[PDB]
Design a binder for this molecule. Structure first.
Ligand SMILES: O=C(NCc1nc(C2CC2)cs1)c1n[nH]c2ncccc12
Ligand SMILES: [Zn+2]
Ligand SMILES: [Zn+2]
Ligand SMILES: [Zn+2]
Length: 401
């Protein structure tokens, strides 16, 4: 983002009366009292969504989308220490930076000089990550992991949503899309920005989660077909359009539905023969003859960011805004019970290890190993926030035969 790009300044003229209408980023940064630009493009912001922290200023009340309000009542030299600590603990497992997301009216921008320092890009003094903080006590730099005791934010980034072309004030623009939400403005601001852009690097267990989801899907569907012998399966929303049980006898019919990022699909808009499979295809109410995996937006993980109108921004390779978890959607189904099924050729005791060996009295070692690995993946999937539901007649007792 060129520092010579124009900044629309009408939103600032109540806190800064008389501000020129003609204004570049270069001149605004100078006026803020200060890595080509502190400000970034929408595109760049989107690529670093994990780094977003709503920030509003209203003595001055500083509010962040973490829900914290600070009053700068204590002097700036202690307030800045709290800011560094809060951002480090919020972001250290999400991002190599911070992006302050503003609805800029002026005070938030003139207050930056009291807790921000800028300079060349640097590296942490204790590791190889880019530096995000600076300490005036030791004249050293640190990343979010090693910033304990550091008093200044270093080379933050920032983006003013009001530059995107909105009519009306923040609240009225936010409330058009979200009924769930200084800190309250910081939250609305980030929320509105997530809605505009969404309604990525490996930072955690992405790869184990995705392999576990693939394994569970194959297990549960294969077993549903064996136990109930459905003649046809309606696979709704498959992004890959690959059969998850390619050797099953059934007639596999695919129906295309992109991941709904706003409201859940209405089943009437989007089948009574056989079984319906919804693997992360979010509808308002699932038919009774369904196998379903639905992500619980309420779960706490480094992969799951707070979203708009109760949904969450699930970032796992790609960004997937997901509508709010609603228990009533599953009213025609029951929770899927854990089980492990295998027909592969053959000390574990388990009533839910459904294999020939266990049927005959004693689980062989191979199926003991595979059961324990499968349990591990299953638990990884549940902990990651996924929930599984199945048609009410599903009964693993039917697998023994
Ligand atoms: O489900 C998988 N990964 C977790 C994800 N969850 C989301 C959104 C919040 C719903 C996007 S990705 C997966 N990864 N490979 C697979 N193969 C077969 C079936 C599922 C998977
Ligand atoms: Zn470090
Ligand atoms: Zn909101
Ligand atoms: Zn066995």
């Amino acid at each position: 983002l060129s520092v010579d790009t124009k900044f629309k300044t009408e939103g600032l003229c109540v806190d800064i009366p008389g501000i020129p209408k003609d204004m570049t980023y270069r001149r605004l940064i100078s006026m803020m009292g200060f890595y080509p630009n502190m400000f970034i493009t929408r595109e760049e912001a989107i690529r670093h969504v994990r780094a977003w922290i709503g920030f509003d200023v209203e003595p001055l009340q500083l509010g962040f989308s973490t829900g914290v309000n600070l009053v700068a009542g204590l002097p700036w030299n202690v307030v800045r220490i709290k800011i560094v600590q809060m951002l480090s603990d919020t972001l250290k497992n999400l991002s190599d930076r911070v992006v302050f997301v503003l609805w800029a009216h002026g005070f938030e921008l003139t207050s930056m000089k009291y807790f921000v320092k800028i300079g060349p890009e640097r590296t942490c003094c204790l590791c190889d990550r880019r530096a995000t903080c600076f300490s005036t006590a030791s004249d050293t730099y640190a990343c979010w992991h090693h910033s304990i005791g550091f008093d200044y934010v270093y080379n933050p980034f920032m983006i003013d949503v009001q530059q995107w072309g909105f009519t009306g004030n923040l609240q009225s623009n936010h409330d058009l899309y979200c009924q769930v939400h200084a800190s309250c403005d910081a939250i609305m601001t980030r929320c509105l920005a997530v809605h505009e852009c969404f309604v990525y690097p490996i930072i955690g267990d992405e790869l184990k989660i995705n392999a576990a989801c693939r394994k569970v899907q194959h297990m549960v569907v294969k077993a549903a077909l064996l136990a109930d012998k459905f003649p046809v399966l309606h696979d709704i929303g498959n992004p890959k359009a690959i059969k998850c049980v390619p050797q099953a006898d059934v007639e596999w019919k695919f129906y295309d539905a992109q991941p709904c990022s706003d409201k859940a699909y209405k089943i009437e808009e989007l089948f009574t023969d056989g079984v319906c499979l919804f693997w992360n295809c979010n509808v308002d109410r699932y038919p009774a003859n369904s196998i379903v995996c639905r992500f619980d937006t309420r779960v706490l993980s480094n992969l799951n960011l707070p979203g708009c109108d109760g949904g969450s921004l699930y970032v796992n390779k790609h960004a997937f805004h997901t509508p709010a978890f609603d228990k009533s959607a599953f009213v025609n189904l029951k929770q899927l019970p854990f089980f492990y099924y295998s027909d592969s050729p053959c000390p574990l005791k388990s009533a839910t290890c459904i294999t020939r060996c266990n049927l005959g009295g004693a689980v062989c070692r191979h199926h003991a190993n595979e059961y324990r690995l499968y349990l591990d993946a299953y638990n990884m999937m549940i902990s990651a926030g996924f929930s599984l539901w199945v048609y009410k007649q599903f009964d693993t007792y039917n697998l023994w035969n």
